[PDB]
Design a protein around this ligand. Sequence first.
Ligand SMILES: CC[C@@H](CC(=O)C(=O)O)C(=O)O
Ligand SMILES: CC[C@@H](CC(=O)C(=O)O)C(=O)O
Ligand SMILES: [Zn+2]
Ligand SMILES: [Zn+2]
Lengths: 347, 347, 19, 19
Amino acid sequence: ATAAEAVASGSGEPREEAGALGPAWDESQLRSYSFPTRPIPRLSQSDPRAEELIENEEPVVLTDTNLVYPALKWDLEYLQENIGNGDFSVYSASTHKFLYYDEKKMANFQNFKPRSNREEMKFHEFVEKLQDIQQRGGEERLYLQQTLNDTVGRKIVMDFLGFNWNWINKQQGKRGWGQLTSNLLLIGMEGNVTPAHYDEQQNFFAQIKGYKRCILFPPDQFECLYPYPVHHPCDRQSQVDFDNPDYERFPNFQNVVGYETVVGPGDVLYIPMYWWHHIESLLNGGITITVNFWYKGAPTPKRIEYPLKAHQKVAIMRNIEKMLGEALGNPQEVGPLLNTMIKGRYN
Amino acid sequence: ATAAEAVASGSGEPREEAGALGPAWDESQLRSYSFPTRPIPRLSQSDPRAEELIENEEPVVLTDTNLVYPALKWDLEYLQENIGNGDFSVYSASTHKFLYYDEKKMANFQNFKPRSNREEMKFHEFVEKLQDIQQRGGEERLYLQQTLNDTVGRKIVMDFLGFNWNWINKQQGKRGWGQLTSNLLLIGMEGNVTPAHYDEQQNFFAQIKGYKRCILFPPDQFECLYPYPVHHPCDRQSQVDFDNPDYERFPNFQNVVGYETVVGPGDVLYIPMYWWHHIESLLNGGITITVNFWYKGAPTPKRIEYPLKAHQKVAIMRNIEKMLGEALGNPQEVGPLLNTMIKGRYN
Amino acid sequence: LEVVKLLLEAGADVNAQDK
Amino acid sequence: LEVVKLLLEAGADVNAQDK
Ligand SMILES: CC[C@@H](CC(=O)C(=O)O)C(=O)O
Ligand SMILES: CC[C@@H](CC(=O)C(=O)O)C(=O)O
Ligand SMILES: [Zn+2]
Ligand SMILES: [Zn+2]
């Protein structure tokens, strides 16, 4: 166990920046949590180990892909001048945690009161409201999350063309992934947190500005992270408050073990499909900018091999909840029926 | 509540037999259980109330159907002489409870040790072994349960033709039921018990000789009776020992309420599909003879009406367990996956 | 086909051992 | 069709609100 407490190195020693510009960050900028973590590997695109982790659907930080090299010059001023006049979704929160919720599922749970509110805005309005909160020492927090579409300026389109499509397109092909579905632009304030959740798509997480601490958990820790019901607005998100974990309701969160890393400008983090991930912008680190690359996952293989992988059971559990909500005619009857199936029978 | 304790009349006063032959039975012949019961209605075939109970799939004892009138002369001697030389399944038990188990499902649960053993035998061998146990004051118990097939003697075939097919065929048609699948002949010793279970078929339960106490529970008490897992050999049977109920494992058995009656020669009990039923041959009442009529249930209606009836949810729960056992590739993984879906999520 | 009909389909098992 | 494939089919939902 002595070697275990040491193997839980977190993100390791902060990287030292070229030109002797000091540590990119310090441990004090990271929030404190209850669980141990390991470092995610930081490797080169050409390192065969990095290739072995991606094909095996394990996370890895790639340091030299140049995936978004043209975008590393992006700041609020540059984007305000060239990202066009399209509408940008901007969530507002009283807290540092920006829990994702699906608006379309809010009807099923009318008792659910979100603490993040979405608001369409022009990017210059976001920079303005961003500047106001700063100038007034306000505790309000903002987090821009917008899919990049046709309504972006020419130079932003030229930056896009300058992405390393040769590299990522080859990755898409070698893993059999589906189409690229979107690129989510992410501009958040220091201290912002996206609580733990998993996505049903493969993700290349390309950091542009600022630093983000990424804590991942493999799909086989489903039992420890307690996602919301599938029909709940917070489907795929963890119910556990990482800041105040309730071990009475979530006892197995005391067995969670994460994979952790801090990405900075130029880093690309492969967040494999179904992998949980907790994203937080370093405290007192300024704004963070990121662009992700969401790809549909490979199809289900013709022949199924047993035993099933953890992510396959997650797919099964999700589908069970879905069709029961469909068959019962009401999502809120899924819980009672399942309990009826279990109590005194399987527990 | 005063009127409730009185409304739980059990099987009511024992019937008095024609010709002043005394009470057909006395309360002391009935085993004692922990739950209250109501009387099932005893009505005439021509009573419109009886028609309303069958169409609404509620139990009812019909007193004058003549469904098996030619079979009311049946005894061990008559059957031994005319039921042919076919093989007859005869379960043997150290106890009065003859819990049904599916032999084909015993592979999935190799830790399951049945206490009833099936044995193919000629009917004269059954009468012989029956006579031996008596002559030796043995505690062994037998229960013949055999589907009636082509290998029965001519007179037994003539008795069959003499059944009131006009009446039951009309019932089959007016309820939209499927085909008649089988007629199970049942010859058991006094005190024999078939513990609580439900069948996926409609059943007309035609008593021939002796008396049987039938305790039924509607499908909406699924939560109180705790069937075994679908893949367990005792699928569709209750896990609760009615003689020693374990309220720690089966807490809701303290809310069970049954419908009860004692049928005798000439009575026909409609046991609706999915309805639980506990069958016991009256103590010190001699052998019992019964022939049931199992019909496939009506198809699923084109348009589904919500809310779903209890039996529809039972159909859903059964199918969920089935496809999970199929998808997971192992029945014994159904429990863990369901618990994973529930704990901290729906409970 | 219809997921609802698949889940509502009833079986036909009874307390009679199959050969 | 194949019950196993129906239950194994993955979705494609991500943390991006749909319009
Ligand atoms: C959704 C925004 C989040 C990233 C993430 O979870 C993802 O790309 O899937 C983040 O950086 O706060
Ligand atoms: C299966 C034999 C049992 C009857 C019964 O449960 C049924 O016809 O379905 C009984 O009388 O002991
Ligand atoms: Zn995500
Ligand atoms: Zn039965």
